Write a protein that binds this DNA or RNA. Structure first.
Lengths: 99, 215, 64, 84, 126, 136
RNA sequence: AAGACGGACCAGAGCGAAAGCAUUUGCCAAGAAUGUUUUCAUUAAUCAAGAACGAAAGUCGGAGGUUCGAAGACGAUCAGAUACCGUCGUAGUUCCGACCAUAAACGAUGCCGACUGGCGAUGCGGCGGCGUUAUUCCCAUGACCCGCCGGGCAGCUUCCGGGAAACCAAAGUCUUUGGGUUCCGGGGGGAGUAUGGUUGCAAAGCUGAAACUUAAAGGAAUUGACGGAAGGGCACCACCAGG
């Protein structure tokens, strides 16, 4: 019997897909049967920025962001708590944690 | 183990931008001395300076970068010419966003001057003013014709006019704007920018123009 | 490398972190500067308004 | 439906919105019309879903343009079926 | 931390407050004695906890009725206070703009009124 | 050589060109073109430990040591080019990159802009490791 | 320069019989959906044999080998490692003409038709509005909003009905048992093994037994116990700071 209806994210109306790799575990996994995670983060983060904003002169520019589209495989994504175990009732929801 | 003490032998040069900008003294850089025992004319006139266009112009942007290439050195002043404009990385990635249609067009075009340029473009279909779809999509046919308009305008306006005037147009994106208008009949569009320019062939026979641009 | 010794006074005891719960987060008004106010972890029991003698703001002391 | 209705003479707005072969009495709603249109000097009969253009001697070319659905028409026109 | 009140105390307190409202004060010492009069409580510690909670309740109560408890006299007072009249019902509201289909509802009831027309910028409310 | 005309009385700009990897963080400021250095102190240089080359203290120490020698050559200001690993590899900057930026800012280098310059392909060629790989 | 690869955009979205399929543009023929008082006038449904295609690896001969890399050889980690982990790197990945014919080729659900229930999306076509925006003098465009109708991938909520349940508008209209047709199963192991035939250059693929063994093999849900699975608390028989 099926423990996941969509099997970790579906591939219906599509006959095959290419595999994506993990960005920290490098292992082959389907692209839409695996976790996909957008990462928008400041270039100077919450760390550097405090002295970088005070020391800056002749500048007026809002901070850059780094954009990277991470892909995680299932085993790594559970492990480091990108996703984590939930109730079987809760599984039927496609609604995820807000960002 | 093996070191030298080399910051006692270097000479200072004032990197000069064109007089087509309000800031012409970009700053200074020290290069190794050009002499017959230690050779540095290579490392001096091969230089490509990556400068932010905001610092070069006196401002309008705070993204965007111009690549400036030393086309000759005259008396510790180094006279640069257009080599490319990109949008850095940050700006470019922030335009690319989910639940939209990313339209890409690229063209190879010969200028009035000697220079071959490859000019990449980007455009986005907008979420319009009463739309209740989250996503913005259209038929493939539409997007294809939008690309032809994009390519045609971009080639036509770079084929005509000298390299400097092409530059001067592409900074306020008047080429961009014309694309937006000609496409507005179909899908209105939001954005439209030249995202990369790659100088493919750069010949010099234009020391005339080089001096004309500076001063 | 080196910086001058900064006296910084406890403004607010943030709470306790540590694996065993034996590290206390503290926010210390930098005292010299009212603009700066930075989070340093104190090992001991902390009573608000007492004064730390920071030898660094390098190597930031933070949750664990 | 509230699941107990019986309709023996169904209204012509819930039978006229449906697909052409799904109607409860099946005849299509397509018709012929007379087109006057001014650059043509004869009254050309045209089919509502013409497919291929109707043209006439009186016009240069101005009568229909093709469309996959209802045929396109130009300037003044009339329609009366008449009697389907 | 410790020695949070138990159910036995709270139940008794509700009881006492409702039926002896006028007798009860707000002072621990006098209420403690009143609890001897109006009840049989087999321990002083228990009686003290009861008395104690009953003062705390009386203090809250004399700002009007409070959560989980009500006294009959206060319920009557609120009832009487609420005679509130917010319309009189139609205002009158006659012959004003109404929706174009609400208009035909009035029209085919032998009235009609002025009515809104035209659609601009749908979706509506957006 | 010395300064340009004064070593601190004008703002001369160079490019930071910080390569942030994991198990090192190279700081390595160059002249605005890129074709000549100015200072060469790695994150392993101040503390070599083979795992503390990217831990904050080493990174701090290095960036301060660079900043010194920079303003001694009249480069008193810098446009920052942070960079990750890049390519069809991890392309995430290490944790010794932020500490380095803060350290040079504090030391007495002045900032003028901040841009991203990370190289990201279309996943040209192939990525390292087999299919089953490391299992976690 | 070489060889490889087309991110982000990219979605329970599209197309293709399936396998499969994302840079730009052009050419070549093909397919569906839709609209359709067009044409033929029963031409159809489904299936032994027979036939087309068929991921990956492998195999034939070249090109080619950038990248990565079954084998091998190295460094660690382990009581054991020959593995995971680091390094070197072979066939191979890529490309062409041949083989081969299988994959959990998974939606584990034959194909065709009819009938039985609510609500809202979205790719696409068509139709309608004293709807918005947009372009040419306005249009006819086009994108959008609302409604309507088809055919797509799905979803949601339901004593609709089924089922052992999990589930499932089909796995419904099955004792009130029967629309058409095809395929496969008859406790578990022996076994896709033996044996003969067949196809393949090879590797392999197809058909496919028995003796004997044994009253359980199995499914699902329920409740406990346990986890070096995830969120938690509480105690100096736990830790902390210390004696």
């Amino acid at each position: 019997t099926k423990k996941r209806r969509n099997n970790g994210r579906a591939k219906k109306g599509r006959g095959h897909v290419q595999p994506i790799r993990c960005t920290n575990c490098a292992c082959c996994v389907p692209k839409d049967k695996a976790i996909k995670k957008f990462v928008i983060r400041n270039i100077v983060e919450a760390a550097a920025v405090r002295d970088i904003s005070e020391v800056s002169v002749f500048d007026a520019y809002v901070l850059p962001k780094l954009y990277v589209k991470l892909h995680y495989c299932v085993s790594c994504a559970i492990h480091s708590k990108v996703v984590r175990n939930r109730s079987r009732e809760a599984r039927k929801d496609r609604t995820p944690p807000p960002r | 183990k093996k070191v030298v003490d080399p910051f006692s032998k270097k000479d200072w040069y004032d990197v000069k931008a064109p007089a087509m900008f309000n800031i012409r003294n970009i700053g200074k850089t020290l290069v190794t001395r050009t002499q017959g025992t230690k050779i540095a004319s290579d490392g001096l006139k091969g230089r490509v300076f990556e400068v932010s266009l905001a610092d070069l112009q006196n401002d309008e942007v705070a993204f965007r970068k111009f690549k400036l290439i030393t086309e000759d050195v005259q008396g510790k002043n180094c006279l640069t010419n257009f080599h490319g404009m990109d949008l850095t990385r940050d700006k470019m990635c922030s335009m690319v966003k989910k639940w939209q249609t990313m339209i890409e067009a690229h063209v190879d075009v010969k200028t009035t001057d000697g220079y071959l340029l490859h000019l990449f473009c980007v455009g986005f279909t907008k979420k319009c003013n009463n739309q209740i779809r989250k996503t913005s999509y259209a038929q493939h046919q539409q997007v294809r014709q939008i690309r032809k308009k994009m390519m045609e305008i971009m080639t036509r306006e770079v084929q005509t006019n000298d390299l400097k005037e092409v530059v001067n147009k592409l900074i306020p994106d008047s080429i961009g704007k014309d694309i937006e208008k000609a496409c507005q009949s179909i899908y209105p569009l939001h954005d439209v920018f030249v995202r990369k320019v790659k100088m493919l062939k750069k010949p010099k026979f234009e020391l005339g123009k080089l001096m004309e641009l500076h001063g | 490398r080196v910086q001058p010794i900064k006296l910084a006074r406890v403004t607010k005891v943030l709470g306790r972190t540590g694996s065993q719960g034996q590290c206390t987060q503290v926010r210390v008004e930098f005292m010299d500067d009212t603009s700066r106010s930075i989070i340093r972890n104190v090992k001991g029991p902390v009573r608000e308004g007492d004064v730390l003698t920071l030898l660094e703001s390098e190597r930031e002391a933070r949750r664990l | 439906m509230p699941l107990a209705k019986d309709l023996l003479h169904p209204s012509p707005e819930e039978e006229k919105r449906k697909h052409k072969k799904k109607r409860l009495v099946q005849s299509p709603n397509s018709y012929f019309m007379d087109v006057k249109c001014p650059g043509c000097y004869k009254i050309t009969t045209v089919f509502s879903h013409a497919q291929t253009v109707v043209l006439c001697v009186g016009c240069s070319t101005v009568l229909c343009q093709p469309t996959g659905g209802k045929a396109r028409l130009t300037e003044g026109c009339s329609f009366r079926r008449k009697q389907h | 931390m410790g020695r949070v009140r138990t159910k036995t105390v709270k139940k008794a307190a509700r009881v006492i407050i409702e039926k002896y409202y006028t007798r009860l004060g707000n002072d621990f010492h006098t209420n403690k004695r009143v609890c001897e009069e109006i009840a049989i409580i087999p321990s002083k510690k228990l009686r003290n906890k009861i008395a104690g909670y009953v003062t705390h309740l009386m203090k809250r109560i004399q700002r009007g009725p409070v959560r989980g408890i009500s006294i009959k006299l206060q319920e009557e007072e609120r009832e009487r206070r609420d005679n509130y009249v917010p319309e009189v019902s139609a205002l009158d509201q006659e012959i004003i703009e109404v929706d174009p289909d609400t208009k035909e509802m009035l029209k085919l009831l032998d009235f009609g009124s002025l009515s809104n027309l035209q659609v601009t910028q749908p979706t509506v409310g957006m | 050589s010395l300064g340009p005309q004064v070593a601190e009385g004008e703002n001369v700009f160079g490019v930071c060109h910080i390569f942030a990897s994991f198990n090192d963080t190279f700081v390595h400021v160059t002249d605005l073109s890129g074709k000549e250095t100015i200072c060469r102190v790695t994150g392993g240089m101040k503390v070599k430990a083979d795992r503390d080359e990217s831990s904050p203290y080493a990174a701090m120490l290095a960036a301060q040591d660079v900043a010194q020698r920079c303003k001694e050559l009249g480069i008193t200001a810098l446009h920052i080019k942070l960079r990750a690993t890049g390519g069809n590899r991890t392309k995430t900057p290490g944790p010794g990159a932020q500490s380095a930026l803060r350290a040079l800012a504090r030391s007495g280098m002045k900032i003028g802009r901040i841009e991203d310059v990370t190289p990201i392909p279309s996943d040209s060629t192939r990525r390292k490791g087999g299919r089953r790989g490391r299992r976690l």
